[PDB]
Structure formats: structure tokens, C-alpha cells
From a paper:
The nap particle is an immunogenic surface adhesion complex from Mycoplasma genitalium. It is essential for motility and responsible for binding sialylated oligosaccharides on the surface of the host cell. Cryo-electron tomography (cryo-ET) of [name] revealed the tetrameric organization of the nap particle complex, consisting of two P140-P110 heterodimers. The P140-P110 heterodimers form the ‘tight interface’, while the ‘loose interface’ is formed between the two heterodimers.
Residue numbers in the entry:
A (entry chain A), D (entry chain D): 953 to 1002
B (entry chain B): 1349 to 1444
C (entry chain E): 1349 to 1396
The structure:
């Protein structure tokens, strides 16, 4: 029982950390990608208008 | 020796239990802290990117306003994840 | 029942060992993968 | 011995992951902060020159 509880007690949070980490990276990447694209759009506009 | 078999049956499981509990606490306590640190780190990353997005947006807005290029790109607004850090709902105060 | 205490002293430690090894592998294998994922994620963040 | 090996086997990498995570966040933050400051500097220059 103790080994089972220990297994679940470590196993369950380890899975949650992996999911949080993966989700968090994806979110940061998306934001950075969106910002990069936005910055690229302004560049293009500046070149086209000047 | 050899008198000790009956207490060995008592003692061995107890040590295993103590060692298992300690191992559980030693691994378990930092895993919770790591999770929190990871979350905090990502939260902070998201905030910094948001600040960066606002800064970059401000500079563009000013450049556009100054150059007469009347069409600020709608996409800078979208980069700001307006997602509210899911505020882990404060665990309801277990009223003891 | 009979002398079943004598193999119990053989069997109990073996199960504990098997269960401990499995627990070790089940926790140990993903911990290595998490580390790698975390590193990769940061590496990618830095690149972006 | 098995419990000791298991403890070290999980304990040692968990510590390394924490250190990597902490170091990695600090690095990303520093970069973003440096970029933000740089963008702010260009803004200031544009306002001052126009």
C-alpha cells in the first residue's frame, strides 16, 4: 500500500508537470511567433510605404 | 544468534516503511516545488512577452503616426495572449 | 495451513524488489524525458 | 540497497531538472528584458528625432 501510494504520489504530479511544461512552452512559442509575425508585417509596410 | 527471526519479521517491514516514507517525502516535496517554479517561470515568461509586445506595439504605433502609414497591423493585438493565467482558484479555505 | 511463513520470507522481499524496480522505472523513465523536453523547450524559446 | 538506488536515481535528476529550469528561465527573461529595453531605446530615439 505504501509503495502504491508513493508511486501515485510521485507519478501523478510528474505527469502534471510534463503537461504544464509542454503547454507553457507552446503558449510562449505562439506568442513569440505572433509577435515576430507582427514585427515582420510592420517591416513590410514600412518598406512598401517608404 | 538465531533467536531473532520473529522480531526480524516485525523490524524489516518497519524500516522499509520508514525508508519508503522518507523517500516519498524527499522526492515528493521538491516535485511540488518544481511544479510551482515551472509555472511561475512560464507565467513570468508570458508576462515579459506581453510587456515586449506592448513595447513593440507602442513603437510601431508611434512610427505609423509619424510616417502617415495609417494602418497599424491588427496582429500585434493578437500576440498579447489575453489569456488570464488561470488563477488556480484559491483552494477554498478548508474550514477546520 | 502449514509452514507457509518460510517461503513468505523469500516471497515478500522479491515482490517488494519487483514493485520497487517497476516504481523506479516508471518514475525514472519519464523524469529523463521531462528533463529533455524542458531543455528542448527552453532551447526553442531562446531560438524564437 | 534498492530503495537507496531508487532514491538517488530519482533524487539526483529531479535536482538537475530544477537547476536547468531555473537557469533556463533566467536566460529567457534576460533576453526578453534586453530586447524590451532595446525596443524602448529605439522608441525614444524616434520620438526625439521626429
Amino acid at each position: 500500500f505504501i509503495l502504491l501510494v508513493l508511486g501515485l504520489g510521485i507519478g501523478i504530479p510528474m505527469y502534471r508537470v510534463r503537461k504544464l511544461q509542454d503547454a507553457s512552452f507552446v503558449n510562449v512559442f505562439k506568442k513569440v511567433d505572433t509577435l515576430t509575425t507582427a514585427v515582420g508585417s510592420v517591416y513590410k509596410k514600412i518598406i512598401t510605404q517608404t | 544468534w538465531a533467536d531473532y527471526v520473529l522480531p526480524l519479521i516485525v523490524t524489516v517491514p518497519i524500516v522499509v516503511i520508514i525508508l519508503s516514507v522518507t523517500l516519498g517525502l524527499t522526492i515528493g516535496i521538491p516535485m511540488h516545488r518544481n511544479k510551482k517554479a515551472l509555472q511561475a517561470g512560464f507565467d513570468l515568461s508570458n508576462k515579459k512577452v506581453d510587456v515586449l509586445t506592448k513595447a513593440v506595439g507602442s513603437v510601431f504605433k508611434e512610427i505609423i503616426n509619424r510616417t502617415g502609414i495609417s494602418n497599424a497591423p491588427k496582429k500585434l493585438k493578437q500576440a498579447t495572449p489575453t489569456k488570464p493565467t488561470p488563477k488556480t482558484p484559491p483552494k477554498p479555505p478548508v474550514k477546520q
